[PDB]
Amino acid sequence: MDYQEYQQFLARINTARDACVAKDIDVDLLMARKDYFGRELCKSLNIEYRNDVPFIDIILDIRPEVDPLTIDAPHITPDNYLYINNVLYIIDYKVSVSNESSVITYDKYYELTRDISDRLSIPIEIVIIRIDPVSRDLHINSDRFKELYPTIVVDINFNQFFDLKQLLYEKFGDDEEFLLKVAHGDFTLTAPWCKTGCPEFWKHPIYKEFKMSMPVPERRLFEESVKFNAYESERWNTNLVKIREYTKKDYSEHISKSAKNIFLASGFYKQPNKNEISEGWTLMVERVQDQREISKSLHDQKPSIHFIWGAHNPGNSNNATFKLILLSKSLQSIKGISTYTEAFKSLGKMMDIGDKAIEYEEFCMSLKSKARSSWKQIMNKKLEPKQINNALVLWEQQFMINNDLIDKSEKLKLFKNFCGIGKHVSKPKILDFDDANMYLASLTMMEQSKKILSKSNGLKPDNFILNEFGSRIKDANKETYDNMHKIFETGYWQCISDFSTLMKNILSVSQYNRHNTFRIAMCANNNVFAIVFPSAKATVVYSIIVLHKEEENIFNPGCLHGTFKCMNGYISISRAIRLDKERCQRIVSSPGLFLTTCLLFKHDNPTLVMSDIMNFSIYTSLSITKSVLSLTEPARYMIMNSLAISSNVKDYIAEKFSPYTKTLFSVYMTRLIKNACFDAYDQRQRVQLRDIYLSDYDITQKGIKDNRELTSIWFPGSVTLKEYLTQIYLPFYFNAKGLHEKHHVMVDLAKTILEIECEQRENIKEIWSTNCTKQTVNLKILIHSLCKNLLADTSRHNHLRNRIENRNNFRRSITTISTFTSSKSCLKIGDFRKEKEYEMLRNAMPNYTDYISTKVFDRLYELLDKKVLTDKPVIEQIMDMMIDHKKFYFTFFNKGQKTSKDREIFVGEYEAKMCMYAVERIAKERCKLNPDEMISEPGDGKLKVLEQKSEQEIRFLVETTRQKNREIDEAIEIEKLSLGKAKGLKMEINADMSKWSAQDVFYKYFWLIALDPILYPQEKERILYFMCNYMDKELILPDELLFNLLDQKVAYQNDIIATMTNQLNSNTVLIKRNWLQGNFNYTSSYVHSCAMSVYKEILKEAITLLDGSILVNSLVHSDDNQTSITIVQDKMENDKIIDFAMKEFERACLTFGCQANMKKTYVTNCIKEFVSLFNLYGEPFSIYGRFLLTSVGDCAYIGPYEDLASRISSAQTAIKHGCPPSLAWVSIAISHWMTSLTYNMLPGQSNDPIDYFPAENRKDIPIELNGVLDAPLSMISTVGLESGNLYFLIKLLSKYTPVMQKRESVVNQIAEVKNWKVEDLTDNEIFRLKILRYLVLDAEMDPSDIMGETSDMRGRSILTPRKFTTAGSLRKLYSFSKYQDRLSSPGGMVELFTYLLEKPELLVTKGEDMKDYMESVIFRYNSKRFKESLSIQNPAQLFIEQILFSHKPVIDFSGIRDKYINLGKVTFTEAYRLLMRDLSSLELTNDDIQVIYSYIILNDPMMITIANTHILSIYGSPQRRMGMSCSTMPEFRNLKLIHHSPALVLRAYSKNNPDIQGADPTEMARDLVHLKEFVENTNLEEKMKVRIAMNEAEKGQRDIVFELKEMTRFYQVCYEYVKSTEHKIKVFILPAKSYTTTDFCSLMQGNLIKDKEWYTVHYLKQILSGGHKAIMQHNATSEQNIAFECFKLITHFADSFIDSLSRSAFLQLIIDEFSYKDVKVSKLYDIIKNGYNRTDFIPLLFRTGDLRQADLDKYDAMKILIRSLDYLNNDIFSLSRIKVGLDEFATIKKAHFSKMVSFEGPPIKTGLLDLTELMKSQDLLNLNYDNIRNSNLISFSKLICCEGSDNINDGLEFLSDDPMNFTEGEAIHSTPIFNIYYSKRGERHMTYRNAIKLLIERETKIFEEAFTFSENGFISPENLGCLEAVVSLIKLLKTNEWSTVIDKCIHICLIKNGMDHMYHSFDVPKCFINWVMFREFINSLPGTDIPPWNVMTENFKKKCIALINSKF
């Protein structure tokens, strides 16, 4: 941890050049890690630190009286010992990831100490403390030791040692001897998976083709390699080395040629520019005109928004019946003649209620009351229309189509030519997007929309989002709050809210619409209506009707049918719209999308116009068509390529960009993109980089400058680069998934697949070539690279085969693998004609391969039941299937993604799944070792990897450039020399691969299989036979696609499908070279990595020819490549290098069969983009807008709480990806609004709970009771929706704890709960506490409990609606048929249930046996929810059903009442009322409050830590986020009590045998003991037994299913208790790098409070608590950390800012009276003295005496006499630094000065400076000399306490005169130009005192000339009289900080001028209490306009005038 020791290790690594000493380096590194952990553990435990203390020594120490030689002490050396309570504990520190060494050392030490334990009559305990370096989880075996130490708070980081190990291994990676020397064990191969290999593989036609393709020597080499057995051979790498040596000549020749190409390359690469963009645009428009039908008519446009809107009418009433009457009258009174005017008038007559409004209301109310009285739908009773006036009414807003009221001809005209009901190869018609008239029409449309919608609403901006989240959003960003207020005031919000409400009403009324009825939908607007036409994927037909007084005052986005005159104005009818419920639901959610988009685009940008942003967002948010889809996604490639250094944007536009402009908005956005391309080319040079700050240990202040110089894209303004990237990339997420149509997408996907297959069949005939032919692989280079990479990878780890089998469950059963037991679909081949009934297709097409789709688990059940599969180890069965399954069949379906063209998705059969599983797991485990591979990297860690690569490339650039240009810089401190100096080049190739799986040479994987060392020859033969049979796979065409292709009746021109299928005579097509998408990810990625390694070699050699330095980092996921190249050379310009690098990148991709997408491949100098993730310049960046937009996404629609928890997930992910707090809060508000809208809980609505509960606002109601979340954003991110209860409890603590403990730790504050008075609690608090006590917890719980259930062990759902829903067909499931047979079997259920009781662990864990699996599969069918999931369900239909059933009795209140002490289903409102009634009778007591606190907070260490962070937080100096970084969330529960896996522990507990398969005998015993203790102390077994007994007695018969359910919850709780370290991968973008839990919490809290700036957070006490997950914590930690921080801060502050002489007196004075963090510093000093950590404060102790020479001896042991020390420190006056020897220096570690604000004490008055305020000073404590000398007199005036000082020179004497540090910045001279700033030791003239002197002189001169009221000067007697007047004035009035700072500044000026005597003699002038003339004088004050004091003097005068006027 020590930085000097880190430097020492770095020097050892750098200077080392022998692999024999690198082992010494690594061993020393491991010892340093162990000793560091031991020292930190001893500090935490507060025990004296020892290492390898002799056992005889410890025996003598514990028993000095006994004579030595009484017994031979064992030679073992314990790390440390501890003797308390007559028990000796032998402690051993271990820093390992495993327990093998721990257990063997435990056994050895125990055996060797038994004899001494018996003799000396002392029990000896062997305690092994083990820490896991990668996840800091502590493991302790001795429970007695853990009893001694209840809280162990070891919080340390091992990242430094990992970095050194990585540096050593990368330096000596090329040395195979070093790898062998550091290898663990030898090369070991497990037992062969198969006993025999395929003999028919050699006869396979595919193998014959491959063999004939290869030349003869390669055929021989392939046969030898596949027939090679590593275990039999003397060396495993015998054949690998032979092949590598054979191919070395060709490999070296290829590398040398490719390197020689650098000279032949010119400087001209594919630069994007305006000419290329224009030519590409011309080619694109030509291609689009050829492929489409271009229309120049505006009347051919399609609706941009399927809606028309008009402002409301304040004069008219908003009652529903009045609106209906008004609509009927307006429809009837249409004047004029038109096509449908008579139909509209007839409809208005049909809906004419007349004057019988009361009768209509009564009829509708009676119907609704009848409907709502039943949980189920009312059946068998027919609704009969009632005639009211001329209206035949069936329901509210439902009317008959009366044949008498409408002519038949008019009715058919309307229904067919208008609504399309009863209605009934050319090119798709699209508008001309390049036509000037068409673009002018689009501009006119957008201008009209802006004009109509920019006006004010005229109504209150009050709404749910604002009311419930305005405070949070305002505190986060007042500007965001103001933007929201403006948005809600404008008319865009009213229009989109009206459209959403109206569309929800349309969806509600369309469910029960009949064929002869039409519905009327109404919204809050009294002028906007909807008429829903009859309808039967369900569709909705609606027409929007708008009433407006003035014509042309309507908002028409190309949806209007016509505007007609009526009574009292005009009526406008929109054209009929037919939409899918999926698009309708998006429209309903659209307000959230609109608000999110507007706030994202406007955030932190004053140069943008909110009107323009909303004008764009209203169209993108409501876009539900493919027209905008065709533009959003290609825009990324177009604009990003244009900004790039090298890109083929011209070819991209010409060949791929295909705008689909069916709408005027699409035309407008096409023009926007076109302009943005040229602008992006023009403005690529305005990107600038921040000044890098390098500390040589970490990088801070890195990235890209924030200057708004780039032009905005979609709307006028200026943006930063980050905002520009957001504007480029966010629009892709405006698209909607599932917009495609199955018919067309199946046709296109089949066409693409068959076209690729046909092209491969015809054109592609060569497999191996040397000239980089398309779809061809260079054989020699491939083989050589594969050999090299395989050698390196398998040399890295010696047990690769064992690791594969262990991690992939190869040795375990088939039923224990998730991918083989899932509910995903799989293909089944065979005769299934009966189930499928299709008949016509079967008869008409002979060669039809019959197939059916089934679930994976069902297929596994079938194969197990038919004995095709067994429960033997899975790998043996997999290889058996590799031989048996000769024919592979696949089918495909469309993904339905959000891109313009859908993606084909392939489904395979079970045997193919298993074979590919084996191959892919082998490839995966070899990819894990390779650093370049990125699929093996867990998700979201790729951001951290990108950051690390960028940081090391920055460091390499700086170091290499400085090292090379040292000579030139020395010569400078010449222009000709500067010309010839070396320059740095940085290159980022963000690349894409074209047709990764479609066009790939599958033969290159044969070599990967054959050259693999870890496989046996028989395994290789079987796998190669599988691959050969895979290359003969057949694609089964889908039945629906075949149906449509057979129902055409007109022959297609060139039907590729018919050609490939023999004129539709077969449904199967043979696919050979296209390994199917997604099946061979790891293998393809490995070969991609090998290709990039060859590229790296080529680049390194080529740069070697240039005598330069290069660093190449390549990241490869599957087909997405991120290659960054850093070059520092001087021979040639950068253009030649860029051209050469790009040409060789393309050539290297083509060499290995890959093909880079040059259209989508672009080169940048700074920006990295690997997988939707960006690294701007060392600084991580991500588009969190996608997570922000997914806040309104679909959910399970289970209930109000379940729905909310799903969307808070998206909010939290957005927070993790860098979303600012205000936008995160907006997303949370939108999620709450969406849920409340779904369940009709919005304010004022029926299910709104605010009235029924004692709460002022919905923040007071619990989430489970339908409140809104109220908690800090850091809490929401960390604990995740438990934050509601946590925040409520913390607020209760902060409100009711006594003042003495108010600033104590959470455990102490909870211990003080017994003193609470329950009578003082408010009604809301009482209600919430009762809810927590009785609804969340159990009545049996007692405050005396020591262990209890954690919040993760219990659910939170209370009010969940129930639905009467049919299960579905489920006919095709063989397992379901077996389950039905078993159910119909006599009593089979009792046996199956009995088996599940006998093996209860099967309920929660996977079974390890076929019988166990088959029983579980049969059992799951009992649960209704599983069957519902099995049936396909539409989320759109579920959402509408939840809306409709909101008033029906759905809540089962019996279950809720069963929760507390001791009917029919109930509605939401009645449930609220009943819950309040039930809770009224219950009582609450201090005992109950203690139970709540103990069971909610004291259980979880994470909950305790979060509560401590909230209570004890101190917020420091604000600062702008300069350089961000990634940091993963650490583990909050470090202590581990269970070692074994939870499944194994549960299996052992179900039985009583600690000895289980795969379970360590003795290790499982303690886990079983712990689990039994947990069960007994929580009384789970007793509670379950009592519950089942009571239920059995109540029912009268044994409810066996109830017993199963009880066992399920019991084992669920047991599983949650015994769950081990999950170690989730959760990374965060944070202002700084965090290493420990406290650092992470500080960074989270400081980052998630304000949008503008982030704060430094330190904690008053120690936040972390040492405890276990389910054990109560009643012990708080010590204050030693506070003492350490205090005295480190004190020593270093005194050294830095105090003169050498005054330092000791300063220390003594501050020790005597001051206090740190509410703790007296004398007490902290006593803690340090009377403690076992005194070697960290040797200089501090020396200055205060102490030492006693024991500390010096201990320090020497860590590596010196007292008098020698005293003599040596004669010249040194440093409090923090002392010299024990002539060169040895004992020092105290530094602490950040931001914590100095925690010191409180009496003033330290010396000279005129009061040092207390200096410690409290914020500006003047900075270490940099420049920053100190450049501070202001406003800050400096705080330190002035003169009381009669004459000279500032003697006043400032009490300041440090040692040299300070200053930041010197230098340029780098690289193609991306940037400056690095590094602090360096300054010379003598720059000291703290000198900086203060310069500050004083400059600022006082400025202030003097600012306040020379008289012309003579500052010292003139008249000016002095004016100063006397002003000081008397300010003394006479109330003190203000303006007055104080002005007084201090004038005082310091007078001290400089030596006017102090009169200053202290200032009094009221004799000419002056005439307040009138004081006012006259101050109003006559000649205030100057000097800029710093201009605002200051005016404010001071104004405040004085206001105060003196308020006085009178």
Partner RNA sequence: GGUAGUACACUACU
Partner RNA sequence: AGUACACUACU
Partner RNA sequence: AGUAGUGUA
3-state secondary structure of 1213: helix
Site string for RNA, 900-939 (x = CB under 7 A): -----xxxx----x--xx--x---x----------x-xxx
Q: Give the C-alpha separation, 1769 to 1749, whole Å.
A: 16
Residue 633 binds Mg ion (CB under 5 A): no
Closest-CA residue to 1007 (of 1027, 1029, 1032): 1027
- Residues 1908 and 1919 sit within 8 Å (Cβ to Cβ): yes
Give which of Zn ion, RNA, Mg ion, none residue 1205 binds (C-beta under 5 to 8 Å, depending on kind): RNA
Closest-CA residue to 61 (of 46, 45, 81, 77): 81
Site string for RNA, 520-559 (x = CB under 7 A): -xxxxxx-------x-------------------------
Which residue lies nearer to RNA by CB, 1240 or 1863?
1240
The three-point CA angle 714-988-1098 to 5° equals 150
Residue 887 binds RNA (CB under 7 A): no
Which residue lies nearer to RNA by CB, 164 or 522?
522
Residue 1543 binds RNA (CB under 7 A): yes
- Residues 1121 and 994 sit within 8 Å (Cβ to Cβ): no
Q: What sign results for the dihedral spanned by CA atoms 260, 261, 264, 266? A: negative
Whose tokens are 């276990």? That residue is: 1668
Give which of RNA, Zn ion, Mg ion, none residue 1969 binds (C-beta under 5 to 8 Å, depending on kind): none
Residue 1624 binds RNA (CB under 7 A): yes
Which residue lies nearer to Zn ion by CB, 876 or 1846?
1846
Tell me the closest approach of the beta carbon of residue 1818 to Zn ion, in angstroms: 24
Cα end-to-end span (Å), the chain: 67
Residue 449 binds RNA (CB under 7 A): no
Site string for RNA, 327-366 (x = CB under 7 A): ----------------------------------------
Tell me the closest approach of the beta carbon of residue 819 to RNA, in angstroms: 4
Which residue lies nearer to Mg ion by CB, 1120 or 1325?
1120
Rule CB under 7 A: choose which of 199, 314, 1386, 1464 binds RNA: 314
User: Which stretch of DSSP H or E encloses residue 1169?
Assistant: strand 1168-1169
Residue 269 binds RNA (CB under 7 A): no
Residue 1949 binds Zn ion (CB under 5 A): no
Q: In this structure, what are the phi and psi dihedrals at residue 1777, rounded to the nearest 5 degrees? A: -115, 130
Amino acid in position 43: K
Q: Give the C-alpha separation, 1988 to 1990, whole Å.
A: 6
Judged by CB under 7 A, how many residues of this single chain contact RNA? 134
Stretch that binds Zn ion, among 273-281, 379-387, 1155-1163, 1834-1842 (CB under 5 A): 1834-1842
Site string for RNA, 1212-1241 (x = CB under 7 A): xx--------------------------x-
**In the window 1278-1317, what residues touch RNA (CB under 7 A)?**
1280-1281
Give which of Mg ion, RNA, Zn ion, none residue 1194 binds (C-beta under 5 to 8 Å, depending on kind): RNA
Give which of RNA, Mg ion, Zn ion, none residue 1842 binds (C-beta under 5 to 8 Å, depending on kind): Zn ion
**In the window 684-713, what residues touch RNA (CB under 7 A)?**
none
- Residues 1279 and 1533 sit within 8 Å (Cβ to Cβ): no
Q: Give the C-alpha separation, 1091 to 993, whole Å.
A: 13
Stretch that binds Zn ion, among 60-68, 176-184, 762-770, 1842-1850 (CB under 5 A): 1842-1850
Q: Give the C-alpha separation, 1587 to 1589, whole Å.
A: 5
Q: Give the C-alpha separation, 1073 to 758, whole Å.
A: 11
- Helix/strand/coil percent split, the chain, to 5: 50, 10, 35
1431 DSSP 8-state letter:
S
Tell me the closest approach of the beta carbon of residue 460 to RNA, in angstroms: 4
Q: How far is CA 1036 from CA 752, 829, 998, 1028, 1048, in A?
A: 15, 10, 17, 19, 20
Q: Give the C-alpha separation, 510 to 513, whole Å.
A: 5
Q: Write the CB contacts of 153 (distance below 8 Å, at least 6 apart in sequence).
A: 44, 1662, 1664, 1665, 1666, 1677
Which residue lies nearer to Mg ion by CB, 901 or 1100?
901
Q: Write the CB contacts of 1228 (distance below 8 Å, at least 6 apart in sequence).
A: 469, 1191, 1208, 1211, 1269, 1276
Tell me the closest approach of the beta carbon of residue 1002 to Mg ion, in angstroms: 24
Residue 1842 binds Zn ion (CB under 5 A): yes
Rule CB under 7 A: choose which of 282, 1429, 1519, 1849 binds RNA: 1429
- Residues 1742 and 1735 sit within 8 Å (Cβ to Cβ): no
Tell me the closest approach of the beta carbon of residue 1220 to Zn ion, in angstroms: 47
Tell me the closest approach of the beta carbon of residue 457 to RNA, in angstroms: 7
Whose tokens are 């701007």? That residue is: 1176
**In the window 366-405, what residues touch RNA (CB under 7 A)?**
367-368, 370-372, 374, 377-379, 381-383, 394-398
Residue 1457: both structure tokens together: 């009442």
Residue 1119 binds Mg ion (CB under 5 A): no
Give which of RNA, Zn ion, Mg ion, none residue 853 binds (C-beta under 5 to 8 Å, depending on kind): RNA
Closest-CA residue to 80 (of 42, 124, 36, 27): 42
Would you call 329 exposed, middle or buried from its count of C-beta atoms within 10 A (0-12, 13-18, 19+)?
Answer: middle
How long, in residues, is the chain?
Answer: 2008
Pairing of β 1513-1515 and β 1799-1800: unpaired
Q: Give the C-alpha separation, 1126 to 1177, whole Å.
A: 13
* Phi and psi based region of residue 1763 (left: phi greater than 0; alpha: psi -120 to 50; beta: remaining): alpha
**In the window 819-878, what residues touch RNA (CB under 7 A)?**
819, 821-826, 853, 856
Q: Give the C-alpha separation, 298 to 557, whole Å.
A: 12
Site string for Zn ion, 1759-1788 (x = CB under 5 A): ------------------------------
Give which of Zn ion, RNA, Mg ion, none residue 522 binds (C-beta under 5 to 8 Å, depending on kind): RNA
Rule CB under 5 A: choose which of 723, 1120, 1412, 1904 binds Mg ion: 1120
Tell me the closest approach of the beta carbon of residue 1745 to Zn ion, in angstroms: 38
Rule CB under 7 A: choose which of 1426, 1722, 1753, 1803 binds RNA: 1426
| DSSP β-bridge partners for residue 127 | 91
Which residue lies nearer to Zn ion by CB, 1310 or 1848?
1848
Pairing of β 1653-1654 and β 1519-1520: antiparallel
Tell me the closest approach of the beta carbon of residue 487 to RNA, in angstroms: 13
User: Which stretch of DSSP H or E encloses residue 1605?
Assistant: helix 1600-1618
Which residue lies nearer to Zn ion by CB, 779 or 1833?
1833
Count of other CB atoms within 10 angstroms of residue 825: 14
Count of other CB atoms within 10 angstroms of residue 1994: 13
Give which of Mg ion, RNA, Zn ion, none residue 398 binds (C-beta under 5 to 8 Å, depending on kind): RNA
Tell me the closest approach of the beta carbon of residue 1157 to Mg ion, in angstroms: 9
Residue 881 binds RNA (CB under 7 A): no
Q: What is the CA radius of gyration of the chain?
A: 40
Site string for Mg ion, 958-997 (x = CB under 5 A): ----------------------------------x-----
Stretch that binds Zn ion, among 1219-1227, 1902-1910, 1953-1961, 1972-1980 (CB under 5 A): 1953-1961
Site string for RNA, 482-511 (x = CB under 7 A): ------------x------x--xx--xx--
Residue 1102 binds Zn ion (CB under 5 A): no
Tell me the closest approach of the beta carbon of residue 758 to RNA, in angstroms: 22
Q: Which residues bind Zn ion (CB under 5 A)?
A: 1842, 1956
Q: Which residues bind Mg ion (CB under 5 A)?
A: 992, 1120
